[PDB]
Curated annotation (Swiss-Prot):
Subunit structure, interactors included: Interacts with TGM1.
GO molecular function list: acyltransferase activity; N-acyltransferase activity; phospholipase A1 activity; phospholipase A2 activity
Tissue: Widely expressed.
The encoding gene: PLAAT4
Name of the protein in its database record: Phospholipase A and acyltransferase 4
Full-protein positions shown: 1 to 125 of 164
EC number: 2.3.1.-, 3.1.1.32, 3.1.1.4
Length: 125
């Protein structure tokens, strides 16, 4: 491609290959994102007291695009908007700035991710 990198659109959501797993993020400003920290750790914790156990709690966090993308791969993938919705972009960015600091525990990682980006949208879904 001619472009230097992929460009995320404001109030649209990005699939992030952050780790040995796929995360979601929402572009709230020019270079700023809201993203999910899953209810599980990376496998093989490396401590003499614990290695195989990885159970934890989920948190929604605010961060820079260049940090979320640093050492990582990514793609814009706004599933439900591509499937149907018109979406009130300013109210999605406002909803992401309300979801900052939210926590979750009852769902498994795959649904914990989808339920997060459904709560980021939640408008025309």
């Amino acid at each position: 491609m001619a472009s230097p990198h992929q460009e995320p659109k404001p109030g649209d959501l990005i699939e992030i290959f952050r780790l040995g797993y796929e995360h979601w993020a929402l572009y709230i400003g020019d270079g700023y994102v809201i993203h999910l920290a899953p209810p599980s750790e990376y496998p093989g914790a490396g401590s003499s007291s614990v290695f195989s156990v990885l159970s934890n709690s989920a948190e929604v966090k605010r961060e820079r695009l260049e940090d979320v993308v640093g050492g990582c791969c990514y793609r814009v993938n706004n599933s439900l908007d591509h499937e149907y919705q018109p979406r009130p972009v300013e109210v999605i960015i406002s909803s992401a700035k309300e979801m900052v600091g939210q926590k979750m525990k009852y769902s498994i990682v795959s649904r914990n991710c989808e339920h997060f980006v459904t709560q980021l949208r939640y408008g025309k879904s």
